[PDB]
Design a protein around this ligand. Structure first.
Ligand SMILES: CCCCCCCCCCCCCCCCCC(=O)OC[C@H](COP(=O)(O)OC[C@H](N)C(=O)O)OC(=O)CCCCCCCCCCCCCCCCC
Ligand SMILES: CCCCCCCC/C=C\CCCCCCCC(=O)O[C@@H](COC(=O)CCCCCCCCCCCCCCC)COP(=O)([O-])OCC[N+](C)(C)C
Ligand SMILES: CCOc1cc(CC(=O)N[C@@H](CC(C)C)c2ccccc2N2CCCCC2)ccc1C(=O)O
Ligand SMILES: Nc1ncnc2c1ncn2[C@@H]1O[C@H](COP(=O)(O)OP(=O)(O)OP(=O)(O)O)[C@@H](O)[C@H]1O
Ligand SMILES: Nc1ncnc2c1ncn2[C@@H]1O[C@H](COP(=O)(O)OP(=O)(O)OP(=O)(O)O)[C@@H](O)[C@H]1O
Ligand SMILES: [K+]
Lengths: 361, 356, 292, 49, 50
């Protein structure tokens, strides 16, 4: 089934290539290998049917033959024989089905064991264990991924209306730091404080790996939110999803996402980050919207949407992206290198360090 | 045993999405509930009602207001059971006194010439229905026999009295259970004398006309007040645009219930855009009155939806003046035909007068 | 027998419902078997009418007419053009009604209310669909790789030559990657083609030339066609074209279509004027305006 | 409910992927369900025999 | 009989799909094709004979 789904996914290429006949033979050969195993299922279920259908007959044969010929206990009166015949039917149902009961009990023991191990697996950290706004105050900074064994992240140190932008290399504690801030990482030491002014409140999120449901385009974008005509239209224009929703056969009702309509990495990233903007919460967290997209002008459209949203709502935005089009202009940069935080260095403060300021521009 | 599920595999499956079938029957049903039906059978769920106690008078009233074939069965069963119950106890008394015993001339039975239960059944029939043949009759010195005879007569009188009362009130009231009042399935909004008017047709299917017919029209809408009030089924009464402003209507030949939509009228903002089925704009027309023959007040409500209202249509004329009398073509009673008319909004229509 | 009548009747009804449910599966498959088939093979003499392989790259058109969605066919109506071997006949027109007109009708896998196409004198339309497509190398738009033997993805099922095609394809693109590819001749563990990039499959499409000595390329550029990858693609294509190949290109990228000897700008089934330098871009006020 | 409290670490997401957990719901819970269907019969069948 | 019918029926279905036109793939959803090729096939393969 996995082999043939890949075959039919690339229908246009296979049909045009005139390779459909060759590839059909490959699927047929696999079925022929499976047909031998299917023979065993069919052959051995006949034995089950035969045994179920011929065991009661054999039991009746030996009982009556033994009583009448060999043992000769008494005569074969109609009353005793047919009362016993009915008893054979009533008693052969459980004698035949007791095997399946034992198998069900054995499967139940296995199933409960597996569920018990799942219920006793790793669990996330328990909740609640002059910025003058929703702020993040980090001083200690001793986090890690695994609950135990070689902690890695350490010395992490980092208000509203703040377009903070963490910049760094691959693997230098960029996405892990954001995940640790969200509260889904393991704490070793320190004290991270969440200040709520407008335990943490709702946070918009768009991870590096795009995540989609299997629902309509508007349903995927809304994420269990009331439909707003102006808001829904505004986000898609910023994300430039109008051509992409038009090419869809149903328009804005196609089953977009996993187990739905196949898409591309760039399109998934845009819609994933688009949903975060629609969230319209006190804080907004983003993680490299253009990392998987090689778009040249869509970054400008994203900048227009971000700047318009930032002016309108002043929600805290941490846009951690490696895009060198709006890096040094009006951004609260901060660099974490080699799996360690370095400094909350502003644009003017970065020149004091003079590490990699000239690389961007 | 003989079932396919001798052993359940319970294996996981991988079936891709296929939701919409060929038949659109899944989304075909989209009807919205109404608090008054077209046939006048209003249906509102009076859920969570305080448990008012039930009384035996309700059962007695249900006997009075039953149907005709059911009343015959109830009373036939009542009469037959009454005779049978008393025949049984008559048999007991005769048995307990030795009357049912073999022949003996010394004793005087409590009931003369009572031998079997068949005679006991016949004796009870004669006593309760008061036929009184006299071959089987009561005797003296048996006080229980006198007592039951009194009880049977008293019971028989009350049972007969109920039957007469039930029959007497049946002929009076059940005659007034017929509704021969027909409205129009679909109403119209037309242009009469320059002013927009909402019109519907109502006729009488009974020769005897309804005396003092009063018409009440109400717009039902979930009108949330600007101050903050919210009401789910607010009813706004609508005038009639009659010759005197009253609610009196004469019903001989069907007429058009035309109301001029003005500033006072809530329909001042009616538009064909808000005429779709899923719009909360419903009209209720109620023509109360009393039928001359019986004297019982009659009511016949009807509900018109926005989808059931046809904008810019005219009712077909009905009454043709023949040589001797007037001809009514009830076949074309509720048939509405189009006519070139303005299709703007009555609120927007005020500009036309202002412009002119 | 009377005692068992009860449970017999119950299980006859229950199994009948199960068969009624499970007999709908065969009903669904019969609906699938009722689909139509266009044409297994054409009506021609296979002895001398066709040739072994069109290594030239010349195609002749006699009032070509295309059809799709028979209610309306506004694409490729009575268009006639000639094919020049070794050139770059670029195609780029209106995004909505002129982008994928020629591309859809090229491989005879679509309807045609009229038309006549012959390749090097042999009857393309009259020849079988599989036979016609057997010797017509093409290119894709999105990166698709059949999981399994990666060599079988590139090399054909027949596998006339292994080392020569392998070395030539490596030189065409990713020589170090192909030579150092752990898959080798078998290359069974494709793993969905995670290791390969988007443009690598295009070289496999080009491998058909080394596979089948087919001059004509049905090219198409989309899905992040980088400048460097295109230049490598262009370098391999022009090297192949100089020897025996003939290039046909359709894409919406301005840079790819700018460096074209001719042009086939198509809008709603109408082809614009074709001239040598970018179809006379300087004189024309339509292609030049849209280019910038 | 345990899924909501579950951790999204690489070890807790690779060894037990979404499919493994989803398959457990489908397969394992149905197996336990059917055992409760057949549980009264397990204690009764010996009595009938 | 059930086993051999399933073996014969599957081969016929696949040999019919290879002859399908381009409009058939571009109009009919793949999920419906997979359903009739996987779910329907499994029933005939395993449960239909029983
Ligand atoms: C010479 C002989 C001639 C014989 C000819 C006929 C003699 C007639 C005698 C006059 C009295 C007979 C009464 C008959 C009543 C007929 C129907 C009638 O009027 O009932 C109506 C009333 C009340 O009952 P209800 O409506 O169910 O009330 C419940 C509820 N709350 C309601 O109001 O709707 O009325 C009642 O129904 C009465 C309520 C009493 C409640 C007591 C409950 C048990 C009653 C029976 C046992 C009595 C107690 C034990 C006595 C022992 C004596 C040794
Ligand atoms: C509806 C109409 C049909 C009317 C004709 C009835 C025919 C006689 C029925 C019958 O079998 O009665 C018999 C009993 O029967 C009982 O004792 C029946 C008791 C039934 C009670 C309520 C039944 C409903 C008659 O038995 P008896 O009255 O005891 O006879 C006296 C004996 N002796 C004649 C030797 C003296
Ligand atoms: C969806 C299954 O839901 C059921 C669940 C039950 C309870 C039950 O013991 N079941 C298994 C038994 C085991 C040992 C095979 C079974 C399944 C299919 C057919 C018959 C049977 N045996 C039942 C006991 C007597 C002999 C036959 C009954 C009936 C149903 C039902 O609505 O079909
Ligand atoms: N979920 C995880 N569990 C355990 N270790 C992890 C996890 N994610 C990352 N790591 C380890 O920590 C290192 C840093 O990961 P991190 O997510 O901080 O990188 P990054 O710079 O944000 O990456 P990217 O380029 O994907 O944005 C990784 O190279 C890996 O060794
Ligand atoms: N000739 C008639 N006799 C009796 N009732 C009539 C007659 N004409 C109309 N009605 C009643 O008037 C209402 C609708 O009037 P109209 O003239 O539009 O009939 P209609 O469109 O044929 O109605 P329907 O579909 O309900 O039968 C209905 O309640 C219908 O029973
Ligand atoms: K009398």
């Amino acid at each position: 089934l996995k082999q043939t789904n890949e075959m039919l996914r690339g229908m246009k290429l296979l049909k045009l290539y005139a390779w459909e006949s060759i590839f059909c033979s490959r699927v047929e050969v696999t079925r022929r290998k499976e047909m031998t195993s299917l023979r065993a299922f069919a052959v051995y279920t006949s034995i089950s049917i035969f045994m179920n259908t011929a065991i009661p007959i054999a039991a009746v044969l030996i009982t009556f033959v033994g009583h009448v010929s060999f043992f000769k206990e008494s005569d074969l009166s109609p009353s005793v024989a047919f009362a016993s015949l009915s008893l054979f039917h009533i008693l052969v149902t459980p004698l035949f089905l007791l095997s399946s009961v034992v198998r069900s009990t054995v499967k139940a023991l296995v199933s409960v064991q597996k569920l018990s191990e799942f219920l006793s697996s790793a669990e996330i950290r328990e909740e609640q264990c002059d910025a003058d706004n929703f702020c993040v105050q980090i001083i200690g900074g001793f986090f890690t991924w695994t609950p135990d064994g070689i902690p890695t992240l350490s010395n992490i140190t980092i208000p509203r209306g703040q377009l903070t932008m963490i910049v760094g290399q691959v693997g230098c504690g960029k996405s892990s730091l954001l995940l640790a801030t969200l509260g889904e990482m393991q704490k070793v030491s320190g004290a991270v404080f969440w200040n709520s002014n407008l335990s943490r409140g709702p946070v918009a999120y768009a991870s590096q790996k795009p995540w989609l449901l299997n629902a309509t385009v508007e349903e995927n974008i809304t994420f269990e939110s009331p439909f707003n005509k102006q808001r829904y239209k505004m986000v898609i224009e910023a994300c430039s999803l109008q051509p992409d929703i038009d090419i869809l056969p149903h328009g804005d009702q196609t089953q977009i996402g996993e187990r739905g309509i196949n898409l591309s990495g760039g399109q998934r990233q845009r819609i994933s980050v688009a949903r975060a903007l629609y969230q319209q919460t006190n804080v907004v967290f983003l993680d490299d919207p253009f990392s998987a997209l090689d778009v040249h002008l869509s970054d400008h459209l994203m900048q227009a949407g971000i700047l318009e949203l930032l002016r309108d709502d002043k929600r805290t935005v941490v846009l951690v992206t490696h895009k060198l089009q709006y890096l040094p202009h009006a951004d609260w940069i901060i660099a974490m290198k080699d799996g360690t935080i370095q400094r909350e260095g502003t644009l003017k403060d970065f020149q004091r360090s003079e590490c990699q300021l000239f690389e961007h521009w | 045993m003989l079932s396919r599920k001798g052993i359940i595999p319970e294996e996981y499956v991988l079936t891709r999405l296929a939701e919409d079938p060929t038949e659109p029957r899944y989304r075909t049903r989209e009807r919205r509930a109404r608090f008054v039906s077209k046939k006048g059978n209003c249906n509102v769920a009076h859920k969570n009602i305080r448990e008012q106690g039930r009384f035996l008078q309700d059962v007695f009233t249900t006997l009075v207001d039953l149907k005709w074939p059911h009343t015959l069965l109830i009373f036939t069963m009542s009469f037959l059971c009454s005779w049978l119950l008393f025949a049984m106890v008559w048999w007991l008394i005769a048995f307990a006194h030795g009357d049912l015993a073999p022949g003996e001339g010394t004793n005087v039975p409590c009931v003369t010439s009572i031998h079997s239960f068949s005679s006991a059944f016949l004796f009870s029939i004669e006593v309760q229905v008061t036929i009184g043949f006299g071959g089987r009759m009561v005797t003296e010195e048996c006080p229980l026999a006198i007592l039951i005879l009194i009880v049977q007569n008293i019971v028989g009188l009350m049972i007969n009295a109920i039957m007469l009362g039930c029959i007497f009130m049946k002929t009076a009231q059940a005659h007034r259970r017929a509704e021969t009042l027909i409205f129009s399935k679909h109403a119209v909004i037309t242009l009469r004398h320059g002013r927009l008017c909402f019109m519907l047709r109502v006729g009488d299917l009974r020769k005897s006309m309804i005396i003092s017919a009063t018409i009440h029209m109400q717009v039902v809408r979930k009108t949330t007040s600007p101050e903050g009030e919210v009401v789910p089924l607010h009813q706004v009464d609508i005038p009639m645009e009659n010759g005197v402003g009253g609610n009196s209507i004469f019903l001989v030949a069907p007429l058009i219930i035309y109301h001029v939509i003005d500033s006072n009228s809530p329909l001042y903002d009616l538009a064909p855009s808000d005429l779709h089925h899923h719009q909360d704009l419903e009209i209720i027309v109620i023509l109360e009155g009393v039928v001359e023959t019986t004297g019982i007040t009659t009511q016949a409500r009807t509900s018109y939806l926005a989808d059931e209202i046809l904008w810019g249509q005219r009712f077909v004329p009905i009454v043709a003046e023949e040589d001797g009398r007037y001809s009514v073509d009830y076949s074309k009673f509720g048939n509405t035909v189009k006519v070139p008319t303005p299709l703007c909004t009555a609120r927007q229509l005020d500009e036309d007068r202002s412009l002119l | 027998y009377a005692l068992m009548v009860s449970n017999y009747l119950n299980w006859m009804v229950r199994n009948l419902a199960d068969m009624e449910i499970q007999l709908g599966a065969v009903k669904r498959i019969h609906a699938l078997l009722k689909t139509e088939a266009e044409s297994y093979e054409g009506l021609l003499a296979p002895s001398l009418i066709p040739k072994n392989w069109p290594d030239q790259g010349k195609i002749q058109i006699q009032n070509l007419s295309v059809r799709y969605d028979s209610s309306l066919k506004p694409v490729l109506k009575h268009v006639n053009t000639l094919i020049s071997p070794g050139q770059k006949i670029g195609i780029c027109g209106r995004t909505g009604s002129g982008k994928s007109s020629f591309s859809l009708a090229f491989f005879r896998m679509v309807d045609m209310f009229e038309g006549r196409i012959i390749i090097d004198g042999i009857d393309i339309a009259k020849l079988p669909l599989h036979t016609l497509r057997s010797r017509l190398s093409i290119i894709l738009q999105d990166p698709v790789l059949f999981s399994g033997t990666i060599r079988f993805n590139l090399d054909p099922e027949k596998k006339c030559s292994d080392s020569t095609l392998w070395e030539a394809l490596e030189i065409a693109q990713l020589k170090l990657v192909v030579k150092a590819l752990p898959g080798g001749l078998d290359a069974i563990i494709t793993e969905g083609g995670e290791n390969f990039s988007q443009g690598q499959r295009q070289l496999f499409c080009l491998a058909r030339a080394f596979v089948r000595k087919t001059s004509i390329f049905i090219m198409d550029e989309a899905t992040a066609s980088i400048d460097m990858a295109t230049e490598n693609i262009l370098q391999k294509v022009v090297m192949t074209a100089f020897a025996d190949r003939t290039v046909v290109t359709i894409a919406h990228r301005v840079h790819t279509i700018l460096s074209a000897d001719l042009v086939m700008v198509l809008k709603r089934g109408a082809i614009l004027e074709f001239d040598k330098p970018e179809t006379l871009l300087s004189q024309k006020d339509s292609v030049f305006a849209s280019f910038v | 409910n345990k899924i909501m409290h579950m951790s999204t670490s690489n070890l807790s997401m690779g060894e037990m992927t979404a499919g493994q957990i989803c398959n457990l719901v489908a397969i394992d819970t149905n197996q336990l369900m059917w055992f409760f269907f057949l549980c009264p019969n397990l204690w009764t069948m010996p009595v009938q025999i | 009989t059930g086993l051999k019918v399933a073996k014969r029926l599957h081969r016929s279905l696949l040999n019919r799909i290879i002859l399908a036109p381009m409009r058939f793939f571009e109009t009919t959803p793949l999920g419906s094709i997979l359903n009739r090729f996987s779910s329907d096939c499994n029933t005939i393969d395993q449960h239909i004979p029983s």
